[PDB]
Design a binder for this molecule. Structure first.
Ligand SMILES: *[C@@H]1O[C@H](CO)[C@@H](O[C@@H]2O[C@H](CO)[C@@H](O[C@@H]3O[C@H](CO)[C@@H](O)[C@H](O)[C@@H]3O)[C@H](O)[C@H]2NC(C)=O)[C@H](O)[C@H]1NC(C)=O
Ligand SMILES: *[C@@H]1O[C@H](CO)[C@@H](O[C@@H]2O[C@H](CO)[C@@H](O[C@@H]3O[C@H](CO)[C@@H](O)[C@H](O)[C@@H]3O)[C@H](O)[C@H]2NC(C)=O)[C@H](O)[C@H]1NC(C)=O
Ligand SMILES: *[C@@H]1O[C@H](CO)[C@@H](O[C@@H]2O[C@H](CO)[C@@H](O[C@@H]3O[C@H](CO)[C@@H](O)[C@H](O)[C@@H]3O)[C@H](O)[C@H]2NC(C)=O)[C@H](O)[C@H]1NC(C)=O
Ligand SMILES: *[C@@H]1O[C@H](CO)[C@@H](O[C@@H]2O[C@H](CO)[C@@H](O[C@@H]3O[C@H](CO)[C@@H](O)[C@H](O)[C@@H]3O)[C@H](O)[C@H]2NC(C)=O)[C@H](O)[C@H]1NC(C)=O
Ligand code: A1BLN
Ligand code: A1BLN
Ligand code: NAG
Ligand code: NAG
Ligand code: NAG
Ligand code: NAG
Ligand code: NAG
Ligand code: NAG
Ligand code: NAG
Ligand code: NAG
Ligand code: NAG
Ligand code: NAG
Ligand code: NAG
Ligand code: NAG
Ligand code: NAG
Ligand code: NAG
Ligand code: NAG
Ligand code: NAG
Ligand code: NAG
Ligand code: NAG
Lengths: 747, 747
């Protein structure tokens, strides 16, 4: 059994991160090819640290300690080492004598202010070199000294990242093999004709944050003198014929020289966020030079103090023939009229329009159907009413997550109106809209009684998100006009459910023939009017977490005893966070017999009647984590033959009964972590048929490490197929001499 | 040192509740007079349980186990026992042979269905007898058999509670000493002329829940046949001359016979909630019979399916000369006009008007100034737009907490408009209002930019609650028209603070000369525009919990390093829940030197620079609970001489340095509970000057119970003035033979 790392298997990885290791372990497997030692307390690396580990092709030593002192030539003997990650290590210099076999070296987030030939010129096989985030913002640091011609001999270098360093000028003598050059936030004020002359294979250039736009910056921002623009020579990109990505975000540009794109026939992504381009958006000659551009980001170009009535889009936007996505967040305007987006309406592949954060008060929604083929209409965070801190591996100027949840967008045309003020959906709200399949009305402070007519203009919505509103469910016909509804999210609409004296109606759930997923989470549901039961012939998943089944299933009330029984097709049920101390036997028996997955985690269960699992012949996963269960049944095989996963972590199990792990043949994963187990007896492990378990979790139990743990230690040796992860965390609580150590220590 | 109970001192109480006791402890102090053993696991009480404890006047055995088996005459030997609480014990009968000295006996929430002479007729000194909640709702239980004349000989009985039992009729032969008779939810359908004839000292009668109004009930409700009213004979209350309280809530009354009140000259509180009295409210002859009534509750009398335009209040309400509070929640009407409350406007002491939960859409607010002296205008939970489950010791039909927070109401006239839809405050919103001192606009979905003019019609607001809105703090003059503002609550307005790209302005805080308390909690504040500092010459308390000081005080940003320095008069600061891993030394030094109380609890602090406490000579309380601190300074007296309270529970302190508890002379309370202390060495406790501590918390530490704990055990004996609460929870983690036991039980 591997210790202290966990080994996963054209390679074998030793997962050894975040285990409080004070030194590199001298017990790593001879066959290991990738060693992850990140987030440990290692303070020193010497030529003896990785001795006899010649198969290593990758080492990750990021975030060590919690600076790391690496001796000259510490990694020199590792002849197949290709990838070395040494991020966030407070390194004062590039380590000396690094192995010549390196193809990837990451030194992000260190204190390296000198890039010398001694450090990297001998690394002739380098393909990717990351030196970003060594001197930036108000960090006490020196200006970066790039030794003349340091990168020149790295003739296989394809990616060079020097962003978030004080460079002042583009380094001369860069190798012509470069494909991606990152120079964001480097204090480069001028780009000359010769700065990139030999870079004929360059596909990406990032010059963002040079002469930044600093008003309301969420980081320490130093603008160029007088808030001046970056000065790019007319011929600076004349030989960058292969450029596909260009990032000029936050370069304080007011004018874009169209000639910059004269010899960029393949430009695909142009990022111009955080500039002063309102004038250029209205009359952009550069827009005629970009017929293959697919993504154009012009977000946050607003004029401080100016809140115009309308957006002014140049007729030249009609020349962006290949445009697929247009981002115009933070332009800031009051109304979107149909005439305002006429230049975009004949672009055949424009599928995404992003107008988030524009303080838009009104939109003529009929304009969207006149676009060729919109698939994502993102209008989140507007004022529409009734009709280290930064991840160095992420985009600094915008979030990279999808605008709309992929599960919602997969259904078809999406309209996101979340975080607006549509407090009431009137009869004309969704008129003249395309066939919307995915609709998000989350966080619109909507307190209306939906009554079956509000969505009649878009009746083919398949995924509806109404979360975080104050909806008053007081009409049995609510949402029934949505005949094709498959996913309905009503999470966080507790406002009226929490008032006992008002009426509450959930009868509409029964009317849907295609409803698959329903989320009623965090609604504080504890009382219903007249109809106490949820019914659906189609529903497969119900999320009922954050409600009050402790009240609904109170021992003195029989009204909700069959609340979920009518969900005849249900396979997944989540009853977590319902303050349950016990479930009445009759209420558990009335859960749908079709269940395959049942979660009752994060309640306060003191008892669980295991005998009742007999009535659930399809139950594969039972999750009882985060409860107060004191014991386990000694005859689980008599009550279930389908259970494959049993999650019991964070409970108070102090003893396993005799014959527990052996008899349940279908059980593959048993999680007993964070319980109160002191020991595991020989009787508890084996009986007649050996264990069909493949994973047994035991970290966080207060084990007694005396000779009484010997039987379990021998069982672990005889059952190497049963994985017990994180042995470093399966720790001795007693006696004093063994406290803090893993149970696998002491013979 | 008392064990297992904690003794507080004309009596001495042994607080022994909720400590997992399996039996009554045989180590209670001889001098103890009140023993609280509630919420333990005691299963048996015998004549040996309280042997030699003759000074006991009160025993509380509620909620035991987690039924309790009490033998005949178990408490008979206790000659001064006056109060016996045996609630929630699943008792099948009233215990036999109870001591004759009893004056108070509570048997609430048991399985007692027979009240016999054998059980209580010998208890001639009984003053209060509680038998409520033994058979109710859908509990499987028998009808209550009251033996004829069982209470007749209890000639000192003043309070009898039989509520939530199936009685069917008022028991005959009740003693004339009765003052309070509770018969709520007892299935009594008829009240005859003789049911209370001899009860001439009765001050309270509760007949609620008999023939209940069951529509939308939040509990199992059985109405009288045909939803019929309770049938009260015309002469049923003719001799109840001393009645002050009458509860007829949920008796399905449609008519109130005015003759019922003909001989009740002192009636003060009349509860008529959950009835069908809309007609009676419009033409109530009974209102002329109640000139001394102070509280009238007519809540939840709405007509199902009827949402009238106006409320119809009889002119006879003008005859309620002594009325102080009128509760009209759940009447249900669309608009409140000035003409509608004319009958109430000349009542000189009417200080509270409660119109919560009426779905009111509009109010002519000018009507409130024409009332004689309104102090509480409660309009929470309406539709106003821009111009066991039940506690047996509480009121079942309404909450008893104050309508308005006492801290807000103490300032003067209060107007509560919380939970409405005043999403924008227009220039006439607060016109024609009285001099409002306390204003609650919480949860109104308000997303406006307050700009210094919204509150000009009520400029003397002292306590303003704007919590749980979507406020856009984007104007330096916000709220500055409120010159006398003392308390401002902006909690839970994170909507716009979360968005980096929008501007955020908190400059207005400086303009107030009388602002004492400011709550900016749970606002997710991580970026401000231009002015990075909070400033106030007056502010004494700032609650900044649930914000992002981890981002504001990021090591690479100097902009917020003096964020609180300008709060020159600050004494209390709460920095909890700010995800802090460390505070930069310069930022801690810029906290106001005027601080007396500083909370930094529930962060993730790994280090705390104790030396910096030198710059805080007035610091009395330091709260660092719920962090990851690994060690404590060995020279705290060199850094502070004012610190009185130091809270360090829920940290990772594994060792106390030498001379820690002895040298800090001002330290009175040190909380080290839930840390990783294995022992406390003799050197850590004493040095030259003995400890001035009065409370040392240590429960939850994994103590090693070998002879190495002997020195601390001897120190505990030599320092009985240093209180250590919950010794039952100061437990041995090792060796195995001592695990689970209290450290004081060792040897
Ligand atoms: C409908 O609109 C709402 C509001 O815009 C969407 O909610 C947002 O959902 C995202 C993705 O789940 C949340 O961000 C995520 O946060 C987690 C951490 O909590 C992080 O691990 C992820 O990387 C990601 O950043 C976001 O907080 C949430 N916003 C709010 C205000 O709730 C919702 O997803 C939309 N629904 C559909 C159907 O697209
Ligand atoms: C309300 O409940 C629904 C249903 O459970 C929530 O949506 C579901 O969210 C889970 C993640 O918690 C999604 O599963 C994940 O899918 C990805 C992609 O396949 C996978 O990589 C993950 O391992 C995981 O399986 C699930 O697909 C999604 N279902 C739907 C229909 O969208 C929803 O997030 C809940 N709403 C709130 C506000 O919490
Ligand atoms: C302004 O109006 C809001 C909304 O009505 C008031 O909030 C409410 O405050 C009460 C008292 O703090 C909360 O109830 C309490 O809950 C705790 C448990 O959380 C319980 O221990 C207490 O016995 C009591 O029931 C109530 O939850 C809360 N409601 C909401 C929706 O936030 C607020 O107090 C008002 N402010 C002033 C100045 O009067
Ligand atoms: C926003 O912060 C304010 C200021 O801390 C919160 O109000 C304060 O709440 C505390 C309780 O957490 C009150 O103290 C208590 O007072 C009672 C009565 O004197 C006493 O019995 C308790 O032992 C405790 O001392 C304090 O008086 C109150 N201050 C004011 C000015 O009202 C407020 O609750 C916070 N808002 C939210 C929504 O969390
Ligand atoms: C992404 C942009 C973020 C900032 C930028 C500020 O330059 N804009 C805004 N930030 C916040 N937080 N809330 C709002 C609300 N509207 N706008 C848009 C806006 C309104 C005006 C009118 N000025 C108000 C008139 O009355 C007195 C003044 O307060 C002027 C300019 C403007 O946006 C350019 C907001
Ligand atoms: C404290 C009272 C609780 C219940 C009682 C219902 O019997 N009332 C209400 N409960 C909830 N949750 N929300 C609302 C919103 N308004 N009202 C008041 C009300 C509205 C109508 C009109 N009927 C609707 C429109 O036509 C079709 C229906 O949907 C009729 C009667 C009525 O109150 C007596 C609500
Ligand atoms: C390298 O790994 C292979 C298995 O993949 C093993 O046979 C060989 O002995 C290893 N050599 C060293 C030096 O670790
Ligand atoms: C690095 O550690 C070596 C020993 O492993 C020591 O000799 C050397 O001084 C250390 N370097 C620094 C800068 O502390
Ligand atoms: C430029 O890239 C091509 C492949 O796209 C490659 O053949 C050529 O050698 C590269 N040039 C250099 C100098 O690496
Ligand atoms: C539009 O997208 C399709 C699909 O990739 C592609 O075939 C077509 O050439 C694109 N049209 C333009 C004008 O770029
Ligand atoms: C609709 O869009 C087309 C481009 O596809 C444009 O020619 C036409 O004028 C637009 N008409 C309206 C009414 O928007
Ligand atoms: C539900 O709302 C519709 C539309 O307003 C109404 O016609 C219907 O009567 C309502 N149903 C009930 C039972 O209130
Ligand atoms: C909803 O379904 C029920 C049958 O369960 C039916 O009585 C009702 O009319 C349906 N309403 C709509 C609008 O489909
Ligand atoms: C049950 O669920 C499956 C899977 O989603 C679905 O195909 C089937 O139609 C559902 N059954 C009914 C009766 O709707
Ligand atoms: C499980 O529930 C049944 C009733 O459905 C009951 O007979 C049985 O005693 C329960 N099991 C336990 C262990 O209490
Ligand atoms: C009763 O308490 C007093 C002290 O208040 C003590 O002197 C006396 O001995 C006690 N008697 C018994 C029997 O506990
Ligand atoms: C109560 O306990 C006594 C012993 O203390 C036992 O003899 C008796 O049977 C118990 N009563 C019941 C009903 O279990
Ligand atoms: C009625 O109460 C008075 C005191 O208010 C008391 O003197 C009188 O004895 C009481 N009557 C009975 C029968 O207890
Ligand atoms: C009004 O209250 C005051 C203060 O308690 C009291 O003196 C006065 O008698 C009351 N007036 C009426 C009409 O009840
Ligand atoms: C104002 O209230 C008084 C009673 O105090 C009443 O006589 C008068 O008619 C009311 N006038 C208006 C305009 O409400
Ligand atoms: C704040 O709002 C007021 C009132 O609308 C306006 O006069 C003032 O210019 C605003 N201040 C700023 C700096 O925007
Ligand atoms: C707020 O205070 C500042 C001084 O700090 C002053 O310049 C400004 O005019 C004040 N505004 C108001 C409305 O009091
Ligand atoms: C400081 O706070 C005290 C106590 O609230 C207050 O009396 C005093 O006026 C405040 N100081 C100033 C300058 O406002
Ligand atoms: C405390 O902070 C000061 C700077 O204000 C620094 O000199 C000192 O080293 C810090 N103390 C510790 C223990 O780090």
């Amino acid at each position: 059994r591997s210790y202290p790392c966990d080994e996963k298997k054209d390679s074998v990885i030793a997962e050894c991160s975040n285990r409080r290791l004070q030194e590199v372990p001298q017990t790593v497997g001879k066959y290991v090819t990738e060693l992850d030692l990140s987030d440990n307390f290692i303070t020193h690396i010497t030529n003896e640290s990785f001795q006899g580990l010649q198969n290593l092709t990758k080492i990750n030593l990021n975030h060590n300690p919690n600076g790391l002192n690496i001796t000259d030539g510490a990694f020199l003997n590792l002849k197949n080492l290709r990838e070395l990650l040494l991020e966030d290590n407070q390194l004062p210099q590039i380590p000396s004598g690094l192995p010549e076999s390196l193809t990837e070296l990451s030194l992000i987030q260190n204190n390296i202010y000198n890039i010398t030939k001694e450090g990297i010129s001998r690394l002739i096989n380098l393909k990717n070199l990351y030196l970003a985030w060594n001197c930036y913002f108000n960090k006490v640091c020196e200006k970066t000294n790039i030794e003349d011609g340091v990168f020149e001999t790295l003739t296989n270098l394809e990616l060079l990242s020097l962003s978030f360093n004080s460079l002042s000028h583009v380094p001369p003598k860069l190798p012509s093999s470069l494909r991606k050059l990152f120079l964001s936030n480097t204090q480069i004020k001028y780009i000359s004709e010769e700065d990139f002359k030999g870079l004929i294979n360059l596909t990406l250039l990032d010059l963002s944050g040079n002469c930044p736009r600093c008003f309301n910056a969420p980081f320490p921002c130093v603008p160029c003198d007088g808030g001046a623009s970056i000065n790019i020579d007319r011929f600076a990109f004349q030989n960058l014929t292969q450029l596909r990505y260009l990032n000029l975000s936050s370069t304080s540009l007011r004018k874009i020289n169209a000639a910059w794109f004269k010899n960029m026939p393949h430009l695909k992504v142009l990022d111009l966020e955080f500039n002063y381009l309102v004038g250029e958006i209205a009359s952009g000659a550069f827009l005629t030079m970009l017929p293959r551009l697919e993504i154009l980001d012009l977000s946050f170009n607003y004029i401080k103090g100016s809140y115009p009535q309308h957006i002014n889009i140049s007729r030249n936007f009609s020349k962006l023939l290949s445009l697929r996505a247009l981002h115009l967040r933070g332009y800031v305007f009051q109304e979107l009229r149909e005439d305002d987006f006429q230049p975009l309406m004949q672009l055949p592949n424009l599928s995404t329009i992003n107008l988030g954060i524009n303080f838009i008060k009104q939109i003529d929604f009929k304009l969207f159907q006149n676009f060729s083929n919109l698939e994502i209409i993102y209008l989140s965070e507007n004022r529409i009413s009734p009709l280290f801190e930064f991840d160095p591996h992420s985009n600094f100027y915008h979030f990279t997550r999808p605008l709309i949840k992929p599960q919602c967008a997969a259904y078809g045309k999406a309209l996101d109106l979340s975080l607006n003020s549509i407090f009431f959906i009137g009869p004309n709200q969704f008129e003249n809209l395309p066939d919307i399949a995915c609709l998000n009305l989350s966080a619109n402070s909507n307190a209306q009684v939906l009554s079956g007519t509000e969505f009649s203009a878009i009746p083919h919505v398949k995924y509806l998100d109404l979360t975080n509103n104050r909806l008053d469910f007081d009409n049995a016909s609510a949402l029934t006009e949505l005949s094709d509804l498959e996913v309905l999210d009503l999470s966080y609409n507790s406002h009226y459910f929490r008032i006992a004296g008002v009426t509450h109606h959930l009868e509409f759930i029964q009317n849907f023939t295609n409803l698959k997923v329903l989320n009623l989470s965090h609604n504080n549901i504890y009382t219903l009017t007249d109809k106490y039961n949820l019914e659906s012939k189609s529903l497969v998943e119900l999320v009922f977490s954050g409600n009050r089944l402790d009240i609904l299933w109170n021992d003195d009330d029989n009204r909700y005893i069959s609340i979920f029984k009518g969900l005849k097709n249900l396979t997944r049920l989540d009853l977590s966070l319902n303050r349950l101390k016990h479930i009445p036997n009759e209420a558990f028996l009335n859960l749908p017999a079709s269940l395959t997955e049942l979660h009752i985690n994060d309640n306060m269960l003191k008892f669980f009647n295991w005998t009742l699992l007999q009535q659930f012949p399809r139950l594969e996963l039972l999750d009882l984590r985060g409860n107060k269960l004191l014991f386990l049944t000694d005859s689980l095989s008599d009550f279930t033959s389908s259970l494959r996963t049993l999650l019991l972590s964070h409970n108070r199990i102090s003893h396993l009964p005799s014959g527990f792990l052996s008899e349940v043949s279908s059980l593959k994963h048993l999680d007993l972590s964070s319980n109160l187990l002191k020991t595991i007896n020989k009787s508890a492990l084996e009986t007649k048929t050996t264990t069909k378990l493949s994973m047994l979790e035991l970290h966080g139990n207060p084990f007694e490490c005396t000779c009484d743990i010997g039987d379990f230690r021998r069982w672990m040796d005889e059952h190497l197929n049963v994985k017990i992860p994180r042995l470093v965390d399966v720790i001795c609580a007693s006696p004093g001499d063994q406290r803090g150590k893993s149970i696998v220590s002491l013979e």
